[PDB]
Design a protein around this ligand. Structure first.
Ligand SMILES: Nc1cc(=O)[nH]c(=O)n1[C@@H]1O[C@H](COP(=O)(O)O)[C@@H](O)[C@H]1O
Ligand SMILES: Nc1cc(=O)[nH]c(=O)n1[C@@H]1O[C@H](COP(=O)(O)O)[C@@H](O)[C@H]1O
Lengths: 215, 215
C-alpha cells in the first residue's frame, strides 16, 4: 500500500468524503470504506471512488453473519467493485469459509479481523483472538487485521500468521495507537479521524508519512 | 409480533422482496431486513417497506464495530426509518452501549445478539454467550436474539434475561429449528428461506402459523 497508509473514510456525506479523499490521494492508494459512508450514500459510492481516485477499496463491513448471509453480503460487495472485504473471525470457520468461497469465485480478497482495537475487545474477543488467527491460517487466509492500540497483541498475531501474510492495523491516532510502533508488526496502518477530522487532511497525512519514512 | 412470526426478507431484488412480503403480510407485522436486501437496493427500501406494508422493521445489521462506528451505523439506520437494530454483543459493552445511546436519542430499540444459530457459533460465540447475555441485562437491554437450532441454549438464555425481556429466534426451518419448540422459550420466531423460497410463501407462512396456534 502506498506509503503503508490506508485512509478510513468514515465521513457520511458524499461531498465531504470526496473532498478529503481527493486532498490526501497523493499519499495513499487504498481507501477503506465502511457502513457509515455506504449506508448514507449507497453502494454506488464504491465504484465512484474506484473510478475518481484509481485507489484499491477495502469494504469494512465487519461481516459477522451465518454462512448463507455472509455469501450474499460478499457477492453484493464485490459486485459493487470492492477489491477486498473485512470479515469477523468470531462467528467461526464456516462463516469465514463462505466469504473465502465468494472471494475465490470473483477474484477478490478477504481480510480476517482477529482482535479489535477498542477497550471492549478485552471482554470476549481478545481471549479468542489467537485461535481466530490460527483458524485463519488453517483456512488459508492471507490478509489480517489486528489492533494498533495493543502492539504486544499485534506482535503475537504476526507470530501466528507468519511474515508472508499481510496485516493491516486500525486504532492509529484517535484511538491512541502510534504509526511507527504499529508498523514494527503490521504492513500498513489504517487512519481515519486523525486525517479526515483535521483542519488540513493533506498536512495530517503528510505528517504521518514523514514519521513513517523514518522507519 | 403478529402470530409470533417475523419474516427475514433476504431476497436481493426489490421486485421479488416486495411481492413475497405483500403475499405474507396478513400473517406477520414485523419484517427483518438485513444487508443482502439493503446492499442490493439501498437504505430507502426500509422506508418503502414501512410505508407499503405498515409493518415494524428490524434492521439486521449484526452491528460489530468500535463504539464510534457503531454510533454512526445506528444513526444512519434509524434515520432510514428502522424501528430496531440487531447488535452483536461479542465486541463488548462499550460497543453495545454506543448503540443503546443512539436508540435512546432517537426513540428506537436495540436487540442484542447473544448466541448465533449456525454450526460455527460453537467455536467462539457459544462459550461467551451466557456472559454476553448477562452483560445485556447489566446494560439494561430488553430485547435479545438467540438460536432456534439449540433450544437448550435458548432455555439458558431465557433464564438469564428473565420473563419480561423480549427474545426472538432465527434458525427455524432451513437451518433445522422447529417453530413450536423454539416458541417454548422465545417470544417470536424469525423465518426466512422456509417462506421466501417456497413455491407459495403465503401457504408456507400459514402452515407455520397453524403449527403455532396449537401451542
Ligand atoms: N474495522 C475496525 C476494527 C477495529 O478493530 N478497529 C477499528 O477501528 N476499525 C475501523 O477502523 C477505522 C478506525 O478509524 P479511526 O479510529 O482512525 O478514526 C474505523 O473505520 C473503525 O470502524
Ligand atoms: N442474524 C442472524 C443471526 C443468527 O444467529 N442466525 C440467523 O440466521 N440470522 C439471520 O436470520 C435469518 C435466518 O433466515 P433463514 O435461515 O430462516 O433463511 C437470516 O437473515 C440470517 O442472516
Amino acid at each position: 500500500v502506498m506509503n503503508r497508509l490506508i485512509l478510513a473514510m468514515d465521513l457520511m456525506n458524499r461531498d465531504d468524503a470526496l473532498r478529503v479523499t481527493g486532498e490526501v490521494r497523493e499519499y495513499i492508494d487504498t481507501v477503506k470504506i465502511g457502513y457509515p459512508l455506504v449506508l448514507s450514500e449507497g453502494m454506488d459510492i464504491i465504484a465512484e471512488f474506484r473510478k475518481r481516485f484509481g485507489c484499491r477499496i477495502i469494504a469494512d463491513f465487519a461481516v459477522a453473519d451465518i454462512p448463507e448471509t455472509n455469501e450474499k453480503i460478499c457477492r453484493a460487495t464485490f459486485k459493487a467493485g470492492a477489491d477486498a472485504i473485512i470479515v469477523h473471525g468470531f462467528p467461526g470457520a464456516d462463516s469465514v469459509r463462505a466469504c473465502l468461497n465468494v472471494a475465490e469465485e470473483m477474484g477478490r480478497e478477504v481480510f480476517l479481523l482477529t482482535e479489535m482495537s477498542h477497550p471492549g475487545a478485552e471482554m470476549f474477543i481478545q481471549g479468542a483472538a489467537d485461535e481466530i488467527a490460527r483458524m485463519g491460517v488453517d483456512l488459508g487466509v492471507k490478509n489480517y487485521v489486528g489492533p494498533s492500540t495493543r502492539p504486544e497483541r499485534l506482535s503475537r498475531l504476526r507470530e501466528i500468521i507468519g511474515q508472508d501474510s499481510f496485516l493491516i492495523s486500525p486504532g492509529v491516532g484517535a484511538q491512541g495507537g502510534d504509526p511507527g510502533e504499529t508498523l514494527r508488526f503490521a504492513d500498513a496502518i489504517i487512519v481515519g479521524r486523525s486525517i479526515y477530522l483535521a483542519d488540513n487532511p493533506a498536512a495530517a497525512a503528510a505528517g504521518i508519512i514523514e514519521s513513517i519514512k523514518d522507519l
